[PDB]
Amino acid sequence: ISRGHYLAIAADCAACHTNGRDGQFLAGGYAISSPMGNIYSTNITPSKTHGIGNYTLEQFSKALRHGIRADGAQLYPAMPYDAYNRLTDEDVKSLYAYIMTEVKPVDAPSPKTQLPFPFSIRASLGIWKIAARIEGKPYVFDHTHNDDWNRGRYLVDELAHCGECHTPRNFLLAPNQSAYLAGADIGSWRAPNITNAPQSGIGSWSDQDLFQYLKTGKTAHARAAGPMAEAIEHSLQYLPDADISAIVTYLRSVPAKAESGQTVANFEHAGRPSSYSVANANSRRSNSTLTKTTDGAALYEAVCASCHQSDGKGSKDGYYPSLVGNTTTGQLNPNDLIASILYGVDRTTDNHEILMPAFGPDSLVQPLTDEQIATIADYVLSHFGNAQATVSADAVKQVRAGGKQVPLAKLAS
Amino acid sequence: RDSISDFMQLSAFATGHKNLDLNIGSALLLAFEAQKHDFSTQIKALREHITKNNYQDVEALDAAMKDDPLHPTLIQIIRAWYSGVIEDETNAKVYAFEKALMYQPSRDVVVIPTYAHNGPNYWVSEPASVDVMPAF
Amino acid sequence: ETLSADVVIIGAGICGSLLAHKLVRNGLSVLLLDAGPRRDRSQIVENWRNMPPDNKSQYDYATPYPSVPWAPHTNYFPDNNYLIVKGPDRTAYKQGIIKGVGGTTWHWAASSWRYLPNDFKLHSTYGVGRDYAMSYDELEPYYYEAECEMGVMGPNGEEITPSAPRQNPWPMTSMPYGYGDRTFTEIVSKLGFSNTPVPQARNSRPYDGRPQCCGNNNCMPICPIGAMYNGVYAAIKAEKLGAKIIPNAVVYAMETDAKNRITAISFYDPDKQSHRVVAKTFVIAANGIETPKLLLLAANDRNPHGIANSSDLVGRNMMDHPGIGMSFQSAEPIWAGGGSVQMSSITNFRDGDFRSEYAATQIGYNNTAQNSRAGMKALSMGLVGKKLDEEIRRRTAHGVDIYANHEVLPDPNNRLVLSKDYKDALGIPHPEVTYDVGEYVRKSAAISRQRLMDIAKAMGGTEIEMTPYFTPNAHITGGTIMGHDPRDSVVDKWLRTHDHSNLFLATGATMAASGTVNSTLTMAALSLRAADAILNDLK
Ligand SMILES: Cc1cc2nc3c(=O)[nH]c(=O)nc-3n(C[C@H](O)[C@H](O)[C@H](O)COP(=O)(O)OP(=O)(O)OC[C@H]3O[C@@H](n4cnc5c(N)ncnc54)[C@H](O)[C@@H]3O)c2cc1C
Ligand code: HEC
Ligand code: HEC
Ligand code: HEC
Ligand code: F3S
């Protein structure tokens, strides 16, 4: 592939500008659940009428790195232009060439983004950009480190923008560079700590495990779900092995950001040798549409034990992950576990599709209430994952709603 | 704790398998005691027979107790441990599924239905020999 | 109190739920009524797991689903007497049904089959049975629509000589065989029989947001993971789009005006409280058994013999696929249990010139795991110690179950009159079926038994046990037959009753021929055709 095509893949610029698996390529129309509402990706195909076909190199660079549209309107920071700001001029030119000459134009307008006041006006984004310290010089290599470290830093920060989800935001929804890659809540999902912290972060991960997780999303202790599954299946699985190795090299040098109340790594939680009782289920026969099944062990056995075995160790071939020693169950924050139960896992790598069925209200296999999901998650945490973590029905409801509402979103009421 | 320990030891001797679930054993003992009020006495008598005659395995005990009145109780214990039920009707209580001993001789090949074997296409592989008893 | 809607569908089975989903997708207001309750898949799984192993060895497909007294369904291990069967072949109509949101598709094997083009013109081709009101070409688009909606996998690149022609490939390709299916295919190929993959509404890959089939081998009576299709999926999708579902709604009466159009229907709740429902169009999608029962029970003064019974054909021409069961211990290991419970079947005798004389048949191999059967049989043998384990392993490795299903012609004396001796908690009479297999099926079985004997001998089977009677298969067709003449049929080619232009019967009772394979996919295709007719009528 061309250099511009590779840069577009690495930057994952198509995962958001394509509405979905059955959406037009780079045509926009994909809804991004921002804290203040839904922001829609715009048409990117070089359509001179409905896309960015009339963009010059300077206008395209401005839109990509400074969040300024062709007309001068400020782009919403759902655009990771705060990450693309430090892209090199050559990379921007290659991306522009790929967009103009290698993407077929699509003549179809995208839905307009309508945000509530005071976020309706895209002119206050100027001093928001000023307060976010977005501006910065184009990336240059740090001669103190080797080329692998520099390339990995470029991939992590500028292209793949891992900090967009893994670095927490401050009150003004700007990146908090003090807690670099320390973990963040990005809605219904939480991006965990991926610093070099041995217990809080991914410091205890083996290099092979980290490489395999980044390349495929599947590892004996961690599986990619939600936004990370999309990132892997749209960008990371197509990166060369050298790029993933460079990313791992840079990640191993990220300063550690410890979490409060952490003693062992997220994948180092042993499983309790406990389970449910078959005898206790006899009273629940002739009791269709389970409502009297309030036992967490019984609910887990009825709903989840088929794939993840009753001991929680999954299948022998590893297709069904072991809930014991799993980073999602072993997290002190049970956000990812609740999200996995609610929405399932769907990751397509190498044209082969993982699928966990969803178990939320909209489930086809087995809808579960907030109390049932909370009970199942509590059982999983106490027996297979972090015993110090707890789940309530209110937490499940909050995850369903799209996570905790940010304080800044209260202004639009 | 004496009754449950004796029942578990007799069950380990009778089924020929040491690894037996303690909770399943307790439930089976409670159900047996509810059904038969002198079950503890029969368990004790079977244990005295085993110790006095020094039966190495359940084969010898079964062969030497074909007409003894304690044979039905031993066969009932074996059936309860293997099938997971004690009665023989449709509303009989099930005390062990996926842990009942009759699913174990074929666990390495045959699926216990509502619990998955390893992966959504595992069956493309050749099965093991019938002459190799897996485990347990 | 009036419960108004554009279309009301009586019965939230696969047919009713698929029709409701198609209707709400096109902007119609739909009221979905079901006599049974809502059911949770995981609770049914837990009920099956705690069902006694003897009820797993012998295929009990009803105990995991509790029977509600107001709308009872058939159970046969206690053998409740909801469905009374008479006639020389009463055992061949002891059919299992499940009542609830989802219907009998809750516990089916999901063998989604397309009928052959000759199955729609059986009478015109062989001079036996009845012709369908529509041809295969007319139902082909609806066949494909149903296959895409339910996610049917099949042998995409493969030449099966007696197979329905396809304009499009299957949505999924058939998953690979287990050991038992491969061994059976080789054996019967040496025997001269063509063992071909069964098209199944099963996920050979993640489909419709549901997991790939992991070979739980429990398709009847419940999938723990939802890797196969259930009509509850269509019910859920319709409800999400605006369809109103009322469980425990036992419809018992229908009202007709001077033009014989249905103006309203009434249903009982579990406390026998009557609720009136008014709609622009009425659909009964209950069963091949429950639809004729409702039609006969709701007889008016304008319709003394039952609703849409001007031809005296409601409840007549009851059809199914009479089966002959076979069990034996194969000389060589078969290891049943790899994949779904029904992975392949012998489709060689689905068609031929012999169909003018005796019935075309389908021979199949049961892929249900034999561990429960082997364990119970070995425990019944009074074995002990290592001999017990060896016997269990040998019997689960060598246990084979073989069947042969036949095609029964529509006979007017195969009836579903209302029973005068039994009722339920709501006072509604129990259904009563008099079933005769007929000389057609008897002549077919005289050869099917020899074929099964040959299969057992080729496998070196011992302890051979053939059923001396005919077994049911729960493909309840006929009862409200379709055709062109109003004097000789109940509904037309659009599944609309001749008597009432307002009533549609989206059920398998409309099918004029039972065919040779499972008939629920044809039922779904006919329901989608009726959906098209309803949409044309109301717009
Ligand atoms: C064990 C088994 C295995 C099967 N395997 C296969 C297979 O492999 N392939 C295949 O094609 N078919 C198979 N079938 C057949 C299949 O289940 C049926 O053909 C299918 O369910 C079609 O049923 P239906 O939609 O007409 O109605 P159903 O789903 O049977 O019932 C619909 C609903 O009507 C409701 N109802 C009934 N009377 C009333 C009333 N008076 N008022 C209100 N609601 C009412 C019921 O409560 C029910 O929920 C199998 C059946 C069984 C029992
Ligand atoms: C029912 C009550 C449950 C609970 C509590 C969980 N699951 Fe599953 N799951 C399955 C597969 C294949 C995956 C990973 C995707 C892949 O590898 O392709 C998962 C994922 C999870 C996780 C997260 C693991 C991670 O590292 O992110 C958790 C916490 C989890 N599950 C718990 C498979 C299945 C099923 C297959 C038929 C069923 C049913 C379930 N899962 C249900 C549950
Ligand atoms: C959101 C827009 C993300 C982008 C871009 C990246 N990641 Fe991510 N990651 C994200 C989430 C929501 C999750 C967890 C999903 C869950 O099940 O809760 C993850 C997961 C990881 C992990 C595993 C850590 C763990 O599970 O404990 C690692 C090591 C990781 N992510 C690293 C990573 C890198 C190196 C990225 C770009 C170069 C990257 N992620 C992008 C959210 C998002
Ligand atoms: C990887 C290469 C990449 C290129 C090149 C790119 N984008 Fe965007 N982009 C947006 C959103 C949302 C807007 C509009 C926001 C606004 O108006 O402030 C936008 C706006 C633009 C615009 C302005 C044109 C217009 O009509 O608004 C251009 C040009 C653009 N993007 C190009 C979400 C994304 C996301 C989301 C995950 C990714 C990744 C992303 N974009 C990656 C890329
Ligand atoms: S039970 Fe389900 S997992 Fe497959 S074998 Fe049947 S569809």
mmCIF file with all atom_site columns, C-alpha atoms and ligand atoms in Angstrom, chain A residues 189 213 217-219 221-225 299-308 318-323 326-329 336-338 340-341 344-347 353-357 359 365 368 376-377 380, chain B residues 116, chain C residues 211-212 214 216 224-225, ligand 2:
data_model
loop_
_atom_site.group_PDB
_atom_site.id
_atom_site.type_symbol
_atom_site.label_atom_id
_atom_site.label_alt_id
_atom_site.label_comp_id
_atom_site.label_asym_id
_atom_site.label_entity_id
_atom_site.label_seq_id
_atom_site.pdbx_PDB_ins_code
_atom_site.Cartn_x
_atom_site.Cartn_y
_atom_site.Cartn_z
_atom_site.occupancy
_atom_site.B_iso_or_equiv
_atom_site.pdbx_formal_charge
_atom_site.auth_seq_id
_atom_site.auth_comp_id
_atom_site.auth_asym_id
_atom_site.auth_atom_id
_atom_site.pdbx_PDB_model_num
ATOM   1   C  CA  . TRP A 1 189 ? -16.229 1.765   28.621 1.00 0.00 ? 189 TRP A CA  1
ATOM   2   C  CA  . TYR A 1 213 ? -2.824  -8.193  22.317 1.00 0.00 ? 213 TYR A CA  1
ATOM   3   C  CA  . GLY A 1 217 ? -6.719  -8.358  20.650 1.00 0.00 ? 217 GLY A CA  1
ATOM   4   C  CA  . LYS A 1 218 ? -6.659  -11.935 21.968 1.00 0.00 ? 218 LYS A CA  1
ATOM   5   C  CA  . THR A 1 219 ? -4.416  -13.026 24.833 1.00 0.00 ? 219 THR A CA  1
ATOM   6   C  CA  . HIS A 1 221 ? -5.183  -12.824 30.177 1.00 0.00 ? 221 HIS A CA  1
ATOM   7   C  CA  . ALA A 1 222 ? -6.867  -10.047 28.175 1.00 0.00 ? 222 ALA A CA  1
ATOM   8   C  CA  . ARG A 1 223 ? -9.343  -9.698  25.314 1.00 0.00 ? 223 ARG A CA  1
ATOM   9   C  CA  . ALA A 1 224 ? -10.132 -6.503  23.430 1.00 0.00 ? 224 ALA A CA  1
ATOM   10  C  CA  . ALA A 1 225 ? -13.732 -5.298  23.607 1.00 0.00 ? 225 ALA A CA  1
ATOM   11  C  CA  . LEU A 1 299 ? -27.398 -16.738 37.607 1.00 0.00 ? 299 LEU A CA  1
ATOM   12  C  CA  . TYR A 1 300 ? -23.813 -17.076 36.386 1.00 0.00 ? 300 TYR A CA  1
ATOM   13  C  CA  . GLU A 1 301 ? -24.288 -20.805 35.836 1.00 0.00 ? 301 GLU A CA  1
ATOM   14  C  CA  . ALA A 1 302 ? -27.559 -20.360 33.951 1.00 0.00 ? 302 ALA A CA  1
ATOM   15  C  CA  . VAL A 1 303 ? -26.399 -17.456 31.777 1.00 0.00 ? 303 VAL A CA  1
ATOM   16  C  CA  . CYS A 1 304 ? -22.606 -17.587 31.506 1.00 0.00 ? 304 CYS A CA  1
ATOM   17  C  CA  . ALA A 1 305 ? -21.309 -21.031 32.511 1.00 0.00 ? 305 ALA A CA  1
ATOM   18  C  CA  . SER A 1 306 ? -21.962 -22.556 29.077 1.00 0.00 ? 306 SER A CA  1
ATOM   19  C  CA  . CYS A 1 307 ? -18.946 -20.879 27.450 1.00 0.00 ? 307 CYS A CA  1
ATOM   20  C  CA  . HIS A 1 308 ? -16.856 -19.792 30.434 1.00 0.00 ? 308 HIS A CA  1
ATOM   21  C  CA  . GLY A 1 318 ? -8.857  -20.485 24.616 1.00 0.00 ? 318 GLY A CA  1
ATOM   22  C  CA  . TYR A 1 319 ? -11.714 -19.361 22.369 1.00 0.00 ? 319 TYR A CA  1
ATOM   23  C  CA  . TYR A 1 320 ? -13.783 -18.639 25.476 1.00 0.00 ? 320 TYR A CA  1
ATOM   24  C  CA  . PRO A 1 321 ? -11.477 -16.629 27.754 1.00 0.00 ? 321 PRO A CA  1
ATOM   25  C  CA  . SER A 1 322 ? -10.721 -17.610 31.316 1.00 0.00 ? 322 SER A CA  1
ATOM   26  C  CA  . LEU A 1 323 ? -12.466 -15.227 33.692 1.00 0.00 ? 323 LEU A CA  1
ATOM   27  C  CA  . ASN A 1 326 ? -8.464  -11.893 33.201 1.00 0.00 ? 326 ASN A CA  1
ATOM   28  C  CA  . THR A 1 327 ? -7.649  -8.186  33.170 1.00 0.00 ? 327 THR A CA  1
ATOM   29  C  CA  . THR A 1 328 ? -11.306 -7.206  32.762 1.00 0.00 ? 328 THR A CA  1
ATOM   30  C  CA  . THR A 1 329 ? -12.446 -9.185  35.808 1.00 0.00 ? 329 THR A CA  1
ATOM   31  C  CA  . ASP A 1 336 ? -15.238 -2.930  31.747 1.00 0.00 ? 336 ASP A CA  1
ATOM   32  C  CA  . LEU A 1 337 ? -16.847 -6.056  33.219 1.00 0.00 ? 337 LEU A CA  1
ATOM   33  C  CA  . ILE A 1 338 ? -20.273 -4.391  33.344 1.00 0.00 ? 338 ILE A CA  1
ATOM   34  C  CA  . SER A 1 340 ? -18.787 -6.550  28.573 1.00 0.00 ? 340 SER A CA  1
ATOM   35  C  CA  . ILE A 1 341 ? -21.879 -8.104  30.142 1.00 0.00 ? 341 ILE A CA  1
ATOM   36  C  CA  . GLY A 1 344 ? -20.713 -8.321  24.721 1.00 0.00 ? 344 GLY A CA  1
ATOM   37  C  CA  . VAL A 1 345 ? -17.546 -8.552  22.664 1.00 0.00 ? 345 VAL A CA  1
ATOM   38  C  CA  . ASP A 1 346 ? -17.348 -8.260  18.881 1.00 0.00 ? 346 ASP A CA  1
ATOM   39  C  CA  . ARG A 1 347 ? -13.879 -8.285  17.317 1.00 0.00 ? 347 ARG A CA  1
ATOM   40  C  CA  . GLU A 1 353 ? -15.102 -12.826 14.065 1.00 0.00 ? 353 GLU A CA  1
ATOM   41  C  CA  . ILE A 1 354 ? -15.233 -13.183 17.809 1.00 0.00 ? 354 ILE A CA  1
ATOM   42  C  CA  . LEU A 1 355 ? -18.652 -12.651 19.304 1.00 0.00 ? 355 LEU A CA  1
ATOM   43  C  CA  . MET A 1 356 ? -19.976 -12.483 22.832 1.00 0.00 ? 356 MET A CA  1
ATOM   44  C  CA  . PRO A 1 357 ? -23.769 -12.082 22.815 1.00 0.00 ? 357 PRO A CA  1
ATOM   45  C  CA  . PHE A 1 359 ? -26.889 -9.439  27.840 1.00 0.00 ? 359 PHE A CA  1
ATOM   46  C  CA  . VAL A 1 365 ? -30.080 -14.357 23.877 1.00 0.00 ? 365 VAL A CA  1
ATOM   47  C  CA  . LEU A 1 368 ? -30.803 -9.225  32.134 1.00 0.00 ? 368 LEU A CA  1
ATOM   48  C  CA  . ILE A 1 376 ? -23.538 -11.847 38.197 1.00 0.00 ? 376 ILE A CA  1
ATOM   49  C  CA  . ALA A 1 377 ? -20.706 -9.305  38.146 1.00 0.00 ? 377 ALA A CA  1
ATOM   50  C  CA  . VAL A 1 380 ? -17.519 -13.092 38.942 1.00 0.00 ? 380 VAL A CA  1
ATOM   51  C  CA  . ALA B 2 116 ? -19.288 -26.248 25.674 1.00 0.00 ? 116 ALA B CA  1
ATOM   52  C  CA  . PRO C 3 211 ? -22.530 -16.270 18.912 1.00 0.00 ? 211 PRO C CA  1
ATOM   53  C  CA  . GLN C 3 212 ? -21.190 -18.973 16.647 1.00 0.00 ? 212 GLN C CA  1
ATOM   54  C  CA  . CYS C 3 214 ? -20.049 -24.152 19.902 1.00 0.00 ? 214 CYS C CA  1
ATOM   55  C  CA  . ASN C 3 216 ? -23.623 -27.589 22.774 1.00 0.00 ? 216 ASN C CA  1
ATOM   56  C  CA  . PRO C 3 224 ? -27.770 -22.158 26.282 1.00 0.00 ? 224 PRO C CA  1
ATOM   57  C  CA  . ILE C 3 225 ? -26.077 -19.484 24.162 1.00 0.00 ? 225 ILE C CA  1
HETATM 58  C  C1  . HEC D 4 .   ? -22.683 -14.344 31.424 1.00 0.00 ? 2   HEC D C1  1
HETATM 59  C  C2  . HEC D 4 .   ? -23.358 -14.115 32.749 1.00 0.00 ? 2   HEC D C2  1
HETATM 60  C  C3  . HEC D 4 .   ? -21.302 -13.908 31.096 1.00 0.00 ? 2   HEC D C3  1
HETATM 61  C  C4  . HEC D 4 .   ? -20.281 -13.188 31.888 1.00 0.00 ? 2   HEC D C4  1
HETATM 62  C  C5  . HEC D 4 .   ? -20.289 -12.649 33.295 1.00 0.00 ? 2   HEC D C5  1
HETATM 63  C  C6  . HEC D 4 .   ? -19.171 -13.106 30.902 1.00 0.00 ? 2   HEC D C6  1
HETATM 64  N  N1  . HEC D 4 .   ? -19.414 -13.682 29.707 1.00 0.00 ? 2   HEC D N1  1
HETATM 65  FE FE1 . HEC D 4 .   ? -18.135 -13.786 28.054 1.00 0.00 ? 2   HEC D FE1 1
HETATM 66  N  N2  . HEC D 4 .   ? -16.850 -13.902 26.405 1.00 0.00 ? 2   HEC D N2  1
HETATM 67  C  C7  . HEC D 4 .   ? -16.865 -14.807 25.412 1.00 0.00 ? 2   HEC D C7  1
HETATM 68  C  C8  . HEC D 4 .   ? -15.812 -14.630 24.384 1.00 0.00 ? 2   HEC D C8  1
HETATM 69  C  C9  . HEC D 4 .   ? -15.575 -15.486 23.168 1.00 0.00 ? 2   HEC D C9  1
HETATM 70  C  C10 . HEC D 4 .   ? -15.096 -13.426 24.859 1.00 0.00 ? 2   HEC D C10 1
HETATM 71  C  C11 . HEC D 4 .   ? -13.893 -12.700 24.299 1.00 0.00 ? 2   HEC D C11 1
HETATM 72  C  C12 . HEC D 4 .   ? -13.969 -12.424 22.811 1.00 0.00 ? 2   HEC D C12 1
HETATM 73  C  C13 . HEC D 4 .   ? -12.986 -13.254 22.015 1.00 0.00 ? 2   HEC D C13 1
HETATM 74  O  O1  . HEC D 4 .   ? -12.013 -13.750 22.615 1.00 0.00 ? 2   HEC D O1  1
HETATM 75  O  O2  . HEC D 4 .   ? -13.184 -13.408 20.774 1.00 0.00 ? 2   HEC D O2  1
HETATM 76  C  C14 . HEC D 4 .   ? -15.825 -13.088 26.108 1.00 0.00 ? 2   HEC D C14 1
HETATM 77  C  C15 . HEC D 4 .   ? -15.484 -11.925 26.957 1.00 0.00 ? 2   HEC D C15 1
HETATM 78  C  C16 . HEC D 4 .   ? -15.844 -11.734 28.374 1.00 0.00 ? 2   HEC D C16 1
HETATM 79  C  C17 . HEC D 4 .   ? -15.128 -10.802 29.274 1.00 0.00 ? 2   HEC D C17 1
HETATM 80  C  C18 . HEC D 4 .   ? -13.967 -9.892  28.975 1.00 0.00 ? 2   HEC D C18 1
HETATM 81  C  C19 . HEC D 4 .   ? -12.659 -10.628 28.753 1.00 0.00 ? 2   HEC D C19 1
HETATM 82  C  C20 . HEC D 4 .   ? -11.673 -9.569  28.333 1.00 0.00 ? 2   HEC D C20 1
HETATM 83  O  O3  . HEC D 4 .   ? -10.450 -9.778  28.482 1.00 0.00 ? 2   HEC D O3  1
HETATM 84  O  O4  . HEC D 4 .   ? -12.135 -8.508  27.862 1.00 0.00 ? 2   HEC D O4  1
HETATM 85  C  C21 . HEC D 4 .   ? -15.847 -10.963 30.547 1.00 0.00 ? 2   HEC D C21 1
HETATM 86  C  C22 . HEC D 4 .   ? -15.583 -10.275 31.855 1.00 0.00 ? 2   HEC D C22 1
HETATM 87  C  C23 . HEC D 4 .   ? -16.888 -11.966 30.220 1.00 0.00 ? 2   HEC D C23 1
HETATM 88  N  N3  . HEC D 4 .   ? -16.864 -12.392 28.947 1.00 0.00 ? 2   HEC D N3  1
HETATM 89  C  C24 . HEC D 4 .   ? -17.873 -12.469 31.201 1.00 0.00 ? 2   HEC D C24 1
HETATM 90  C  C25 . HEC D 4 .   ? -17.852 -15.904 25.381 1.00 0.00 ? 2   HEC D C25 1
HETATM 91  C  C26 . HEC D 4 .   ? -19.141 -15.940 26.099 1.00 0.00 ? 2   HEC D C26 1
HETATM 92  C  C27 . HEC D 4 .   ? -20.259 -16.813 25.714 1.00 0.00 ? 2   HEC D C27 1
HETATM 93  C  C28 . HEC D 4 .   ? -20.176 -17.754 24.573 1.00 0.00 ? 2   HEC D C28 1
HETATM 94  C  C29 . HEC D 4 .   ? -21.284 -18.673 24.155 1.00 0.00 ? 2   HEC D C29 1
HETATM 95  C  C30 . HEC D 4 .   ? -21.332 -16.537 26.692 1.00 0.00 ? 2   HEC D C30 1
HETATM 96  C  C31 . HEC D 4 .   ? -22.721 -17.099 26.853 1.00 0.00 ? 2   HEC D C31 1
HETATM 97  C  C32 . HEC D 4 .   ? -20.670 -15.504 27.528 1.00 0.00 ? 2   HEC D C32 1
HETATM 98  N  N4  . HEC D 4 .   ? -19.413 -15.175 27.162 1.00 0.00 ? 2   HEC D N4  1
HETATM 99  C  C33 . HEC D 4 .   ? -21.335 -14.856 28.675 1.00 0.00 ? 2   HEC D C33 1
HETATM 100 C  C34 . HEC D 4 .   ? -20.667 -14.155 29.789 1.00 0.00 ? 2   HEC D C34 1
#
